[PDB]
A paper describes a structure:
Under these genetic constraints, cattle have developed a unique mechanism to accomplish antibody diversity by forming the broadest distribution of CDRH3 lengths and the most frequent occurrence of cysteine residues in CDRH3 loops. Consistent with the five structures solved previously, the 7 new CDRH3 structures also showed a long “stalk” formed by 2 anti-parallel β-strands supporting a compact, globular “knob”, further establishing the stalk-knob configuration as the general structural peculiarity for the ultralong bovine [name]. Each of the knob structures starts with the conserved sequence motif [CP(D/E/A)G(Y/W)], in which the initial cysteine residue forms the first disulfide bond with another cysteine residue in the knob, and the motif forms a type I β turn. The compact globular folds of the knobs are maintained primarily by several disulfide bonds, a feature that is similar to the core of other small disulfide rich proteins or domains such as voltage-gated sodium channel antagonist mu-conopeptide, CnIIIC.
The four antibodies with 6 cysteines ([name]-1, [name]-2, [name]-3, [name]-4) used three different cysteine pairing patterns; [name]-1 and [name]-2 used, while [name]-3 used and [name]-4 used pairing patterns. Interestingly, not all of the stalks possess continuous anti-parallel β-strands, as shown in the stalk of the antibody [name]-2 CDRH3. For the antibody [name]-2, a one-turn α-helix and a long loop is packed on top of the knob, again connecting the second and the third of the three antiparallel segments. In contrast, in the knobs of antibodies [name]-4 and [name]-3, a two-turn α-helix and a long loop extend from the first and the second of the three antiparallel segments. These four knobs could be described as two-layered structures with the three antiparallel segments as the first layer, and the additional structural elements packed against the first layer as the second layer.
Author numbering:
A (entry chain B): 2 to 215
B (entry chain A): 4 to 23, 29 to 72, 78 to 183, 187 to 239, 246 to 269
The structure:
Amino acid sequence: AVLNQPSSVSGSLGQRVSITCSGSSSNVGNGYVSWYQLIPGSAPRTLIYGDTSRASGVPDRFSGSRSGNTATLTISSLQAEDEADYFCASAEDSSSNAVFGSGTTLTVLGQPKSPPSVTLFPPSTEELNGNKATLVCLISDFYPGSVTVVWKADGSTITRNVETTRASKQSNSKYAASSYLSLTSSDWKSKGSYSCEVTHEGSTVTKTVKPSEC
Amino acid sequence: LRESGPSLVKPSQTLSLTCTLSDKAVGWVRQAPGKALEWLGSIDTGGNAGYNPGLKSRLSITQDVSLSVSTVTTEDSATYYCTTVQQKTKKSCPDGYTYDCGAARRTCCSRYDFCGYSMYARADWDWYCTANYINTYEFYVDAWGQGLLVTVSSASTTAPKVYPLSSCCGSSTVTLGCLVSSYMPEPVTVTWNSGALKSGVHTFPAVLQSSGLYSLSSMVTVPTFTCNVAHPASSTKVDKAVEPKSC
């Protein structure tokens, strides 16, 4: 048995959002549900216990409700620091047996668009003291969080040996990502220029390193 | 709250952690990567302990709090949390029997004039009274721990080699980094100047090349600087200095 939740919910900043939690008489119908918030890198924080008892430190914007076999959690006056996964929970057939909802990820829209900052690092002397060369392209401080990255070498797109991470939120609620080019030392000194091309909302930022001038 | 234990165990072994006074009820919640929260076990003040029925058989919890799972498999790789639980069971007269008679009789009655009667003392007792009860359970989690990710794998703990990241000498806002390359498994923690430098720091998510080895970078922005990398699976703590290029 598992409690059904919507996969995701989204709203504009300062607004209201609602998340359901549909169970049965064995679990949700038998009493009062519980809610928890998970932000990546942060420990989960209890949001509501009982049908409506606000958490020990949660503000008034969060609200709870229940009608029948489905419970709903409400978030008013949305903020940017409320992007998180929210989990409903309750007990079934035992007071020390718990069941959780499938989870719901909330995203607040309408934040100011920001262009990405790009920094392209050359291989370190110690890494080139083996015979590997890793170029590191660090993308940061962009919104929305969807960039595309291509690598160039001597006016030609590089197809092989490229790995890029998905974008993740920062502490200032802007997005960041990184891309890696993994070569040998002989290949690093083989070509004359390497470029990291980052595309975001129809606009491109390009950084270049030259193995001769580093 | 604080959980402690190994970050990597081989398949078909036992995984044991510990939580770090005794005037509370602590429970263990685990979450596989991307999956939903999964209840494991609780522990009250009196020594009792409630478990997931499906995961009870391979689970235990004993300390003077420390848990233990048996014959772990790849499906046991998860982030294990230590929570502060607050369970409660409340027996209630099945409603209809509007009057809850005392504890001496341990019965519920539709009319109060039948409360001073033991079970089946009166021939009419069966219609207006019963001895059963309605069992309703309440539960939540008072507090949480940060979590300790434990990875189950047949792979061997490979420690990372950290490299400094500095720009080619070719100016208004300096940017340095630290490349933690080729480690296994997750996670690693990067701070700067032992944490004295908190502003302008981002530690990117990890990447996985074809070799199955993780790499990640941490960047710092500034107007010397030493990044501190730590890998618990290899007991490794490196403090590599980032010295800028002369040129």
